[PDB]
Amino acid sequence: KSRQLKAAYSIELAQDLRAVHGMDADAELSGILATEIMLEINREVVDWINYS
Amino acid sequence: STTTNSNSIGRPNLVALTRATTKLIYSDIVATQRTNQPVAAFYG
Prior knowledge:
The structure is cut from a larger assembly and holds chains A and B. By secondary structure, chain A is an all-alpha fold.
């Protein structure tokens, strides 16, 4: 079974985010998405344990 | 959808500063010469 998520962002975001904060705006979204998917999976495993 | 409506700003860049002042021109207008006494007296 599959699982997936989208970033959705503008160019202007990335330009300003970099200029103001030193952060990337591609990497943070990438980080959040990859992290959230694995976090949701890890939660699924413990949920099935308590379920079963 | 993350855009510039989410990414707030800290401070603006000044870019430039200006100090309007009178162009001070008198050196070329008067016959300036230092005096070394409280009183000056010119010879006609």
